[PDB]
């Protein structure tokens, strides 16, 4: 009989009878009509007013001047206040509703056995001596916790043994048997029908929870990509669907059905906002009318992105749209939430932290939060604590050394590196060096990056950072610790002059193979003449063989760090070599576009800066991109050759 | 061991056990608990109470054995002479000792009975109901019947000590046994109607109880086919001897005895009950071992209702089999949750073996032929592991899709034949825009479709006419507003009388409640037709479209050409599966706003991915020379789909990006 | 051969495949695989030009040192799931002009 619009107001429809809601809203404003009401019923009006102002129904559609709804979530689980929920659980429960939220909190901390037992206790003590809402909710949450336990035990003890070596069996076998026996053929479809007939008339709005799929709102989401040239009726519904599930302590917030449309609403919304932009630019102007993208991430948006999105989903978000144009509101709140995540990570690893279900549930949001952190300007102390946690207390089974370095390079894009962060990274490198004394220890990375990139980043941000601790460790070196000498070779610029002098005597340069080994580890910076003569003999050996590294030598010569001229006598063979040593007399018919796919930004910049090859390369690229749809060739052409 | 224990069972037991499981799954099983389940663990029986009555009454202990009449005569004599006070004191002293529940009660409640009826004055079953978490309205006195709180009845026929340990609240003496129908009319009538309208299984009774004999005498006055013969779970430590079994089966008791099933001792009542209870429960999760006769019979029992339906999509076939097998869209089937006999695998193997078919029954060959014709038209081919060259042809055997206006106009002008022809004529009329006549045709179909017990035509006609009411309301609202100014004349579509009539008959419809009000067998067989009332039927293939969209776009940005199966075949075989389901069955909501956008989105994704694949950046060879064999051959159906479910803006955006 | 996907912005074929290795020096390696890392945002402060951080695993754990550029050949190469794919690997190894034409699991760190 009334369409309760999510924007805040209510509109009438099918109210064939009297307009009770309109009269109620009219008396909401008139004090005289309030006064004329009877005494016994006045308190009921006050209770209704409190309920209707809490649920967010402001006024009718004819006077809905103010409609901006500020979403507020007061649930402790949403903000990840683990220290509060643990204290609450330790506190004994005085009522059943307090017991109910204690059960829900126990479910969010991974202690599913205790949560199930406490739900069973609630069921026993609240069979029907109430309105029945708690009994119904605790039956559904019990079944959901049982399903979660079954799914975890079919996966943790099923295949994930290698994630912790040997089967940790987080749930006892006797407990598993007990829950299987107590939950044989539990009809969840008919549970609502078993309730008293009075309940089925009053709490009719609680029917969807006992369904195999209940959130069939995704069909509404198809309105977000319509190309007719709003979207705020979907975001507000998302908060409407989050303030129900997360505040009524319901165990339907960790399943894949919930996570699937949150990952679908938050992706479709940002994609459509990205399409509202870059389309108004077509006919309104780049900056005259292009004020902002339109979307505005807030605390309750970043929290959802952290909790439900995965790394690949976040990457898909970044590849499709430019999030950098979307400002992150409430920077302080995001900073505090990130600091809380860091404190939880630090406290988890330092303590026992054997409990694995909560670890798996929480590591995903921790990783997503520290991934998305790059868009938020973090305070100095907050950033220091974040980096310290991510470096010294994040498990290596989830984040490898390469991914760890990627995470910091991601965090340092939007913020500088004061003394604290470089000090933390220096301490991390010191810890790595102390770990490297064990000759049987080797780094394992799934990104190709290693500890060299940390020193490289430190040097890039601070050109004269001399880690005195590393210099002392180098001074105290011996001959037999070969792996330590290799690791310190990987971090040569961070050592002191006396440290470098002591180190260089351990391993000299030899022929070309070791020469290139030193070049890779950055042993030499200025090409000494002895290195230059060694180079020629390799090429002179190559001439004998001809009658590899040749491209590397040509590129070095093109970069003008090789100043030898007799090598000019040795041209007329490889295409790339002649290209990078003698662009004047190259016949360009032998050029292959594939070379351009292996060149970093600086090499292409130097190529574009040279006159004698700019036109040839750009026309080659245009010819290649005309007959193909390769995005790499176009990207190179537009970034550097225009 | 238990698997072959199920085999060493008499055919009577084999069929009784499956009937009980069917009733339990159907919400029709009503348990009948008696004395013997209570006294199993520690609860005191009537014999010791009669003994103490003899002691307090006759002075000396009872000598010999008291006869059956004395069981009620001695307490009655004590009450008549010494009075009610001592009787109540004795009952209070005896019946206060709380005893723990026993696993037999848990097994009884684990079969989800519709009701349980007991003659036990104890609350063992009551507590087991509370502790397990299953709600039951306790009915023991007459006043409870009027004040029933729910639809589930825990009926204490003889009363209980819930209002106090008094002799009036329980039927223990001879007076209240003889004057039972004069003291407890309502509860007796409720018992009789429950026994008549449901399935009754007696447990704990031993053919020597007054309640069993009273019920059997009550049965004799119930015509012949008006009653179902209740089951009987006898647990005496002695064989039935096969003559009293005949007598009681003739009188209306299909006896099941635990002595024949298991070789227990004479003091093994717990094991005697537990054997039958576990045997009943384990048969509730699976059927007996099957043969060539029963596998085809089971499939035909699960598929025959779908025969009336013209076409059924492949994704929801998992709901038909209750998630037993995952029916892949490509036409393959994989095992998902079938923890039992692999009936689908055997069906497909028998399909691929003519010699294995010659050992079928007489008419079961025709049933398998019908199932083969059904499955061949549905695009399912073989198992997931055994599949190769599954090329299939897309075809729509309808008229609305092809846009033949004159043809279906002539068909409408032709004479009707049956309900199906009238249904398709009504759908064609709605498609032509003459919604006013379509509503009347659907109303006539509803009126004439109930005399024949089919349900499908009636249900679909109701859904179609409700959607037609929605469509005409939307058209009216558009015409009286924006439509009034878009075109000059207001162009009143429908008469005011017709609109008033539809408004009067549509109020308080509650469309989502239509399936709940459907007969039980209809919703059991047609579990898949529930999705038509709401928009759930698009959720299954929308959640898996929004996920393939991100997957394809990720490869677009990454630029990773694939040399194998294209990800845009799951959506392609879901386009012409939902389209075929929605059009061949002549349902409405083919013009539904939500359905159109799904088609548009899928088509847009298909064309984006195909245009990306068209301009490959491969200068090398493929598998040997080239991997791809073709591209996006825009068929006639593709053009119709683009033409019917796209607007000018959508096609413009598609052009400006391909 | 259904798991081979060609990548465009880097000349590489991704394929979960293990190949025996023969190089110029007498040292020989059993079935192993490569991992390429396309990073155009890598720290290239020195004379570094390659956008790919290419490395080698022997058995999923044994990362061998680069040392000199070994003149490796595909030799016998197994997909480890269906059958030997020696021809299917060697035939697309040429006309690529990029080192390590066939690798597994390009990380694509952008």
XYZ file of C-alpha atoms in Angstrom, chain A residues 123-124 127-128 135 139 142 182 184-186 190 193-198 212-213 215-219 221-223 225-228 257 260 264 267-268 275 279 282 316 319 624 627-630, chain B residues 110 112 130-135 148-150 152 281 284-285 319 323 531 534-536 538-540 542-543 546-547 550 554 557-558 561 593-594 597-598 600-601 611 615 617 619 649-650 653 656:
94
model
C 17.673 -22.074 20.971
C 17.198 -24.070 24.172
C 12.053 -21.995 22.500
C 8.915 -19.851 22.248
C 14.280 -18.098 17.877
C 17.775 -21.184 13.713
C 22.803 -21.999 13.209
C 22.176 -32.990 15.234
C 20.262 -34.627 9.772
C 17.659 -33.638 7.164
C 17.029 -30.174 8.578
C 9.753 -25.394 5.621
C 6.041 -22.764 8.109
C 6.748 -24.519 11.412
C 6.499 -21.236 13.300
C 3.233 -20.342 15.065
C 0.531 -18.897 12.840
C 0.692 -15.593 14.724
C 18.602 -21.189 -1.251
C 18.945 -17.880 -3.127
C 19.225 -11.814 -3.124
C 17.743 -11.734 -6.616
C 18.484 -8.020 -6.923
C 21.143 -8.629 -9.590
C 18.430 -8.437 -12.250
C 21.688 -4.200 -11.750
C 21.222 -4.450 -15.527
C 19.891 -0.866 -15.402
C 24.798 -0.172 -18.129
C 21.904 1.191 -20.205
C 23.362 3.619 -22.731
C 20.520 6.164 -22.772
C 26.178 -15.105 -2.809
C 29.130 -11.862 -5.577
C 29.086 -6.664 -8.949
C 32.196 -2.701 -10.156
C 29.188 -1.754 -12.286
C 31.223 6.050 -18.787
C 31.291 10.735 -22.698
C 32.873 14.410 -26.099
C 40.109 -5.454 -13.209
C 42.361 -1.673 -15.817
C 52.305 -1.997 -38.091
C 47.101 -3.566 -40.208
C 46.752 -4.865 -36.635
C 44.817 -4.115 -33.460
C 47.796 -4.482 -31.116
C 14.989 -36.813 12.627
C 10.641 -34.615 10.207
C 12.587 -28.680 22.545
C 16.243 -29.725 22.740
C 16.532 -30.582 19.036
C 15.059 -27.197 18.104
C 11.791 -28.280 16.474
C 8.564 -26.546 17.471
C -3.512 -24.332 19.235
C -0.474 -22.143 18.584
C 0.834 -23.691 15.348
C 2.214 -29.033 14.158
C 16.721 -43.140 8.115
C 15.633 -41.505 3.343
C 18.867 -40.367 1.656
C 16.658 -28.600 -9.666
C 21.479 -30.885 -7.412
C 11.160 -19.482 -10.951
C 9.561 -14.069 -9.828
C 12.727 -12.971 -11.624
C 14.788 -15.823 -10.162
C 17.280 -14.755 -14.838
C 19.467 -14.716 -11.718
C 21.049 -18.084 -12.522
C 22.931 -13.278 -14.960
C 25.374 -13.897 -12.108
C 28.475 -10.486 -15.025
C 31.394 -12.789 -14.144
C 34.984 -9.246 -16.277
C 40.567 -8.819 -18.359
C 43.242 -5.358 -21.404
C 45.901 -8.063 -21.017
C 44.714 -14.300 -27.421
C 12.185 -5.012 -19.480
C 14.687 -7.003 -17.418
C 18.542 -5.912 -21.124
C 20.099 -9.311 -20.422
C 21.310 -6.825 -25.100
C 24.210 -7.164 -22.660
C 35.503 -8.250 -33.113
C 41.826 -8.740 -35.825
C 47.980 -9.781 -34.036
C 52.176 -13.226 -37.443
C 21.512 4.268 -28.733
C 22.778 0.752 -28.012
C 27.451 2.713 -29.067
C 31.356 3.503 -32.315
